[PDB]
Symmetry: C2
Subunit: 260 residues, 2 copies
């Protein structure tokens, strides 16, 4: 059988096609989010890779910030639930999940069943989110996808003193003007983000296993800096940005069984 999960965030749209409730036969990410052609183009592509059509999908569930402004799905489910489901499907004994997306950072604490025990989120400040990195990458004139590997070359990381995205940009521009090494600039950028998010994590208390998901988790530099700041191993799946859409597809699989 096939089920579908859609995760339409305010920054990107994520889709997964799941097989018999255990095999992803296609996944897709479009860097356009809620209220764009994001969802449309996502389906388009999944149908391509697998060669399937809407008829072939027994159940579809949508999650993320745009789930409600979207018809038609069978269920619309909280992205907190969907990320937890997807992560637990890949990584067992997960007790802390750190979701860093385009415009917010979330920390979930789970009980031994994968159910939510506690939760903290920054969604008011652009620092410590993907927007911080997106702004900086545009200032440094590289794609966000390169930052992880660029920072790997850093030998004398440049500190950013400002926690504010706006004041930090001014510091980075200044560093750029006096020819600080780009790799050292990026290293300090990664550290600013990790400092912000790790403070969130320390408030709820780290409990292993700690897993990072979200688009920003694709940035290996951020993951390293986070592991440094919280002083705990961090497990990252190979499909960090897609754990929400995976979770939604698994709730879809639940639904399909339910309609035996």
């Amino acid at each position: 059988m096939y089920t579908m999960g859609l995760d339409i965030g305010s920054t990107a749209s994520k889709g997964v096609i799941l097989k018999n409730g255990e095999d992803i036969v296609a996944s897709e990410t479009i860097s356009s989010g809620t209220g764009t052609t994001g969802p449309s183009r996502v389906l388009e592509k999944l149908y391509g890779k697998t060669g399937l059509a809407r008829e072939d999908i027994k159940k579809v569930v949508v999650t993320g910030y745009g789930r409600m402004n979207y018809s038609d799905a069978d269920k619309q489910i909280s992205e907190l639930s969907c990320h937890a489901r997807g992560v637990n499907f890949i990584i067992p004994e997960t007790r802390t999940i750190i979701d860093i997306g385009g415009q917010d950072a979330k920390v979930l604490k789970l009980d031994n069943n994968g159910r939510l025990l506690n939760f903290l989120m920054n969604d008011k400040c652009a620092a410590g989110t993907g927007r911080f990195l997106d702004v900086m990458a545009k200032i440094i004139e590289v794609d966000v996808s390169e930052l992880g590997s660029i920072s790997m070359n850093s030998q004398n990381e440049v500190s950013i003193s400002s926690t504010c995205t706006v004041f930090a940009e001014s510091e980075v521009i200044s560093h750029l003007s006096e020819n600080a090494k780009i790799e050292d600039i990026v290293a300090g950028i990664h550290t600013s983000v990790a400092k912000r998010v790790s403070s969130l994590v320390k408030r709820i208390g780290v409990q292993r296993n700690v897993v990072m998901v979200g688009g920003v988790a694709r940035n290996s530099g951020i993951v390293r800096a986070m592991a440094r700041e919280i002083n705990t191993e961090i497990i990252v799946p190979d499909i960090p940005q897609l754990t929400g859409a995976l979770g939604a597809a698994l709730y879809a699989f639940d639904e399909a069984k339910e309609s035996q």
Copy 2:
């Protein structure tokens, strides 16, 4: 006698030459702060315009972020003290001072002698400061000096839901694309700043007279929105951006009189 006050902030450098502790004979703002060529060009303009030279100045005081790092003045004094002194010189019975500058906002509560009783400051976040306005003005393609007049024509403010400068910027850009009325976009911008600064005022407790100073107080749209948010009349001096330099020049006058009093002058 002449004294001089210099207020070197992180955004702008301001200078005042004061005659006999009473008349401002020269004033000058240069939109470059610490540490640029800003202070030097302020001095050039004060001296140039008065034909005076360093020698004619009996005492010099420096204040602001960069007072340290400025050699040399007879004294370097807190900008809190300097704004309080300058404001009290101009506006009697002042009990609350709101200083909105390029990168922070401060609220001072003063006692009946003009002494600091309480204090709150946002200096970590660009929202609710001149930087927020500077960023938005760039986006809407208007000079920051034009914002006040534009906002006067607003009849239906376009509200900004985000408190963050970066997220708010995206909302404004969206409004511009939807061809929202510019005066209503600007009014919403002014309202965002006022909500964030007025929260400081309310925590400290408004006490009349309320005075706004700082370069952002030159934006009458910000002043109107502030008065609305705190539900109190706000007085703005003629020279809101220069009150720190004026306070410094007054402390310089105090120093000058003090040194006159450690000597006797005996004439026939």
